[PDB]
Design a binder for these strands. Structure first.
Ligand SMILES: [K+]
Ligand SMILES: [Mg+2]
Ligand SMILES: [Mg+2]
Ligand SMILES: [Mg+2]
Ligand SMILES: [Mg+2]
Ligand SMILES: [Mg+2]
Ligand SMILES: [Mg+2]
Ligand SMILES: [Mg+2]
Ligand SMILES: [Mg+2]
Ligand SMILES: [Mg+2]
Ligand SMILES: [Mg+2]
Ligand SMILES: [Mg+2]
Ligand SMILES: [Mg+2]
Ligand SMILES: [Mg+2]
Ligand SMILES: [Mg+2]
Ligand SMILES: [Mg+2]
Ligand SMILES: [Mg+2]
Ligand SMILES: [Mg+2]
Ligand SMILES: [Mg+2]
Ligand SMILES: [Mg+2]
Ligand SMILES: [Mg+2]
Ligand SMILES: [Mg+2]
Ligand SMILES: [Mg+2]
Ligand SMILES: [Mg+2]
Ligand SMILES: [Mg+2]
Ligand SMILES: [Mg+2]
Ligand SMILES: [Mg+2]
Ligand SMILES: [Mg+2]
Ligand SMILES: [Zn+2]
Lengths: 155, 206, 127, 98, 118, 80, 24, 60
RNA sequence: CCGGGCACUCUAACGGGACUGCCCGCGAAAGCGGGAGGAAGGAGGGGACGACGUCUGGUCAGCAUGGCCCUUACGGCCUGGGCGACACACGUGCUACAAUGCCCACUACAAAGCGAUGCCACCCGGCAACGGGGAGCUAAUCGCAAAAAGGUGGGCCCAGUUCGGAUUGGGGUCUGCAACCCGACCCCAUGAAGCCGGAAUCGCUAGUAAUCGCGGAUCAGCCAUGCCGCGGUGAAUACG
């Protein structure tokens, strides 16, 4: 976006919990435009959250998403002819986007058989502070703040 | 690689089809070929008269061929035998046995086909091309004709290099759908090559 | 007695008839859950009623045809909204912020020459 | 009970001829049921612009055929007086059946 | 068990197991299990000795199988080559036989890609 | 995996020729441009010169060649 | 997938009918 | 469009399959529309000249 | 389906409708930001449309055409071959490498088109391609027709396999005078590479991308996975 500021899209709230974040996670699960399939996957994963945890799956979901959100990332910058890994903070929208994308991608890296089990296990492990998504957050917050010497290249 | 045909661009509004008749899919091509032969034989014989348009209408085995000529005295002949011979050839080519009509064109300098034909004749007589275009545009503009433009293609004056002389004045809004721009095209067959003559005449707004 | 709404979404129409009853819906002679229930967004078609929190004051007879069942669901939503507005105009001030009476004009964009699907330019390599 | 199927390429011409038939049949026949749209038959033609390769322009045209369904009820013997020879239009074909 | 050759499928559905016979696909496996009156859903280890004898009795001599099948295909190709036919020439050069192009892919008949200079 | 139809087609150009040869003997090379014709059993033993587009190749027909076309034994292209 | 002659999607892709895709 | 090939018009093409279609105007062999009997180029030209009734530019 | 009627849906002609008109803030103005009302606004979305000219751009092989050249052959007819040749290289695509999947059964919604030496309901034979019979349809009224992903149930249980259908053997159908070179399709058998792709590189900002099927032009048939259109489901992201 060069001329305008590219205002953010407003998603429809969830048909079950009424949360737009749930709908965004559905969309990140969606594949080839199959909305009903992704909804089946996520709601069956929520049915897996209960009977495995006494907590409501909405709380576990939100807490996992909060545990995956990175505080600082590292972007590349061309200075003096060289390329440096400059650390800088992360806007909340990018935090949410990276969190949901990492959750889906780490869930599909699990050895679980079907997708609902993968998403449910990833959500639970991320809510309790482990899994591939938390590893991604730790790696990003390691790369960033591992190159603190470039903090003056913030821009 | 631009500038599509204005007549075809305005066939919906401010321009009607020359052939206006209905025909099924099993008969459209045959009547179309017949109209093409009609226009072919017509434009080969009436060129000395200066025909600008040949309208063809069909209802049932009857064709109302209306030829718009600036000089009907040539197509009529002495006492009307020329139109008799033309209808004879018409009935010989097409066994439909149809009639024929002639319409005079007032101020032929307002019909772009005849303007282009005049410019092409002048080019064929070895006349100054730039002066020919300027004079033609002036004759068009000097009688109504809110806009005018005449274009002559390469080999201007018999030169070795192809050129394009512009020489236009008035208003020619080609992108305006309601422009009502009469368009005409003519050829000049010379000893050195082929000259394409295009004529745009703008009149009326709505 | 009876209140009618048309609604339309992505080339789909859904005649919505609201007659005061128990709260059960019929669509093309089938139950609301025998056409739906395999489509998660189906409940959204009943969102106008939840907008006024009636949910039991109107039986619905809906005749839907056109597009796919999702556009049909949204057309049912708009038809219920229109019939509910015709019932009482004061409901408009309650339905306009939710935009249930807003017509969704998103239509499949026409395919164009030179591309693959109306925008997908053919891949080139230049070498 | 007389089937009338009008067909043509111009909607203005077909509409004017249909209104002419309706007005010529009202004064001499019964209550005419008016014309029915009879949806258009569109046939398109895609043709490359240039005579050479130039594959991605294609400038397609269309040819549409419109139809009309006057279908006068009560074929009174006075109706055909003002009918069966009174017509301005040219590029319009008429189909008549019992 | 051992049916229609020295091959033994095991521990899966009987039709899928018979797919592991060289002369048998899914159609012939379904036909055999249908004419033999055997449930295709049962596993191999869940087959009766009588059912195995029945399937063996049917399949062993109802179509041509591994040994005779491979020998007959080799004999067909050998006959095409010995008569000097065009298909025999295509088999002789290791090229497509069924009218495909060779300026391009159809590499699966030519083996690996032997790149040269140019 | 090939077949044409019931009523196998054979070009009647050489069909009468081969039987006319059989009616009196075993005459030598015959020249035929009709490579589309199908081999019939009454041709076994003769030698047909099939035109491959440039020349006539002396295709000798044996017993195991029945059913094929003449062009299958007259290659048209040259490679290596 | 869509390239197997002996499947439903194969017949649908190749636009034909047969043993693996009847006409009811 | 060679003149000899305009022999396409033939009451005795010796076979039905050998009978193909050509453009009646310019003698073209390829891209010959069967509805008009013309090729694509003559189609575009005569459509621009308005000599094809009912033919209009498409846009939607 | 009949009686029955033009309310609704649809169909196709015309017309209305949005102009920063209104409100608030800013501003010299144009206009900008927000809001109300509205189906929709700040170009509502998409086409058609692409200036003086540039590339001595492309095509005399669509046609026209100056010049040059051939005229018992550089013209003309025919048979056959060739344009489909394969040690290799690249471009554009199609199908995949699977469980958000595959298969079987049942079942539910679309738009745009095509159809008389045509589309072919339906009945019978055939595993089938298809054949025989034969209704309707000058076609909003009959046919192509089944839409597919989808839903419901069941099977497969992570293995080059119920993934993937290349290759090849055999047996057939149809078009056509004729399928060897060199057609499509059906059936049995065969079961390849392929486990998400190096350097590098492409498309797309919303009903878009992605994915799913449907039709058409040319065409006897067809190598169409192409091209032009049609609708179904339907994202992610834009700090700058
Ligand atoms: K130039
Ligand atoms: Mg990761
Ligand atoms: Mg689409
Ligand atoms: Mg363009
Ligand atoms: Mg096997
Ligand atoms: Mg046979
Ligand atoms: Mg398969
Ligand atoms: Mg010529
Ligand atoms: Mg042909
Ligand atoms: Mg009305
Ligand atoms: Mg109305
Ligand atoms: Mg404009
Ligand atoms: Mg050059
Ligand atoms: Mg060049
Ligand atoms: Mg070629
Ligand atoms: Mg080849
Ligand atoms: Mg080589
Ligand atoms: Mg060599
Ligand atoms: Mg290249
Ligand atoms: Mg049967
Ligand atoms: Mg009806
Ligand atoms: Mg299941
Ligand atoms: Mg396998
Ligand atoms: Mg391998
Ligand atoms: Mg695997
Ligand atoms: Mg853009
Ligand atoms: Mg076809
Ligand atoms: Mg196709
Ligand atoms: Zn032409």
């Amino acid at each position: 976006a060069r001329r305008r500021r590219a205002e953010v899209r407003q998603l429809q709230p969830d048909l079950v919990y009424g949360d737009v974040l749930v709908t965004a996670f559905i969309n990140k699960i969606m594949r080839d435009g199959k909305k009903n399939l992704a909804a089946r996957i996520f709601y069956d994963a929520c049915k897996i959250i209960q009977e495995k945890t006494g907590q409501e799956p909405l709380k576990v979901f939100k807490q996992a998403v909060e545990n995956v959100k990175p505080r600082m990332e590292v972007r590349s910058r061309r200075v003096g002819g060289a390329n440096y890994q400059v650390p800088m903070e992360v806007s909340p929208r990018r935090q949410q986007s990276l969190a949901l994308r990492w959750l889906v991608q780490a869930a599909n890296q699990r050895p679980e058989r079907r997708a609902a089990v993968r998403i449910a296990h990833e959500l639970m492990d991320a809510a309790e502070g482990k899994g591939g998504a938390v590893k991604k957050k730790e790696d990003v917050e390691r790369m960033a703040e591992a190159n603190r010497a470039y903090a003056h290249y913030r821009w | 690689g631009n500038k599509i045909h204005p007549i075809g661009f305005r066939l919906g509004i401010t321009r009607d089809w020359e052939s206006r008749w209905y025909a099924g899919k099993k008969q459209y091509r045959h009547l179309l070929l017949e109209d093409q032969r009609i226009r072919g034989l017509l434009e080969k014989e009436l060129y000395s008269a200066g025909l600008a348009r040949v309208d063809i209408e069909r209802a049932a085995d009857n064709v109302a061929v209306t030829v718009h000529v600036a000089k009907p005295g040539v197509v009529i002949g002495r006492g009307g035998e020329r139109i008799r011979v033309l209808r004879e050839e018409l009935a010989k080519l097409t066994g439909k046995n149809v009639a024929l009509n002639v319409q005079e064109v007032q101020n032929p300098n307002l019909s772009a086909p005849l303007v282009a034909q005049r410019v092409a004749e002048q080019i064929e007589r070895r006349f100054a091309v730039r002066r020919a275009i300027k004079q033609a545009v002036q004759r068009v503009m000097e009688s109504g004709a809110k806009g005018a433009k005449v274009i002559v293609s390469g080999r201007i004056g018999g030169a070795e290099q192809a050129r394009t002389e512009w020489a236009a004045q008035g208003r020619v809004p080609l992108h305006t759908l309601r422009a009502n721009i009469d368009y005409g095209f003519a050829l000049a067959r010379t000893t050195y090559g082929v000259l394409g003559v295009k004529a745009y005449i703008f009149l009326g707004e709505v | 007695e009876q209140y009618y709404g048309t609604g339309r979404r992505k080339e789909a129409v859904a005649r919505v008839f609201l007659r005061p009853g128990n709260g059960k819906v019929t669509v093309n002679g089938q139950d609301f859950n025998e056409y739906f229930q395999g489509l998660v967004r189906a409940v959204a078609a009943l969102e106008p009623l939840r907008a006024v929190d009636a949910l039991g004051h109107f039986d619905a007879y809906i005749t839907v045809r056109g597009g796919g069942k999702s556009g049909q669901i949204d057309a049912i939503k708009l038809g219920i909204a229109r019939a509910l507005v015709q019932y009482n105009p004061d409901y408009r001030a309650k339905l306009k912020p939710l935009g249930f009476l807003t017509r969704d004009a998103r239509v499949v964009e026409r395919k164009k020459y030179g591309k693959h699907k109306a925008r997908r330019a053919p891949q080139y390599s230049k070498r | 009970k007389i089937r009338i199927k009008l067909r043509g390429f111009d909607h203005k011409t077909l509409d004017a001829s249909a209104q002419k038939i309706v007005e010529a049949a009202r004064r001499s026949g019964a209550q005419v049921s008016g014309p029915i749209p009879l949806p258009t038959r569109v046939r398109r033609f895609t043709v490359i612009r240039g005579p050479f390769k130039h594959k991605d322009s294609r400038e397609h045209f269309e040819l549409r055929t419109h139809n009309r369904l006057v279908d006068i009820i009560n074929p009174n013997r006075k109706t055909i007086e003002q009918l069966m020879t009174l017509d301005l239009p040219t590029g319009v074909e008429i189909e008549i059946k019992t | 068990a051992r049916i229609a050759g020295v091959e033994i499928p095991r521990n899966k559905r009987v039709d899928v197991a018979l797919t592991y016979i060289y002369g048998i696909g899914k159609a012939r496996a379904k036909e055999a299990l249908e004419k033999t009156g055997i449930n295709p859903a049962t596993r191999v280890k869940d087959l009766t000795e009588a059912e195995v004898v029945r399937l063996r009795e049917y399949v062993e001599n109802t179509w041509k199988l591994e040994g005779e099948l491979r020998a007959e295909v080799a004999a067909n190709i050998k006959r095409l080559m010995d008569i000097g036919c065009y298909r025999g020439l295509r088999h002789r050069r290791g090229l497509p036989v069924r009218g495909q192009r060779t300026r391009t892919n159809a590499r699966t008949r030519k083996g690996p890609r032997k790149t040269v200079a140019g | 995996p090939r077949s044409l139809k019931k009523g196998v087609f054979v070009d009647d150009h050489l069909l009468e020729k081969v039987l006319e040869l059989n009616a009196k003997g075993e005459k030598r090379l015959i020249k035929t441009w009709s490579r589309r014709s199908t081999i019939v059993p009454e041709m076994v033993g003769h030698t047909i010169a099939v035109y491959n587009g440039k020349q006539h190749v002396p295709v000798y027909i044996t017993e195991n060649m029945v059913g094929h076309k003449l062009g299958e034994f007259a290659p048209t292209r040259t490679y290596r | 997938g869509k390239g197997d002659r002996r499947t439903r999607r194969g017949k649908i892709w190749r636009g034909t009918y047969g043993k693996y895709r009847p006409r009811k | 469009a060679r003149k000899a090939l305009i022999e396409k018009a033939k009451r005795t093409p010796k076979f039905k399959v050998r009978a193909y279609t050509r453009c009646v105007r310019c003698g073209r062999a390829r891209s010959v529309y069967r509805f008009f009997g013309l090729c694509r180029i003559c189609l575009r030209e005569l459509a621009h000249k308005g000599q094809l009734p009912g033919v209009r530019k498409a846009s939607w």
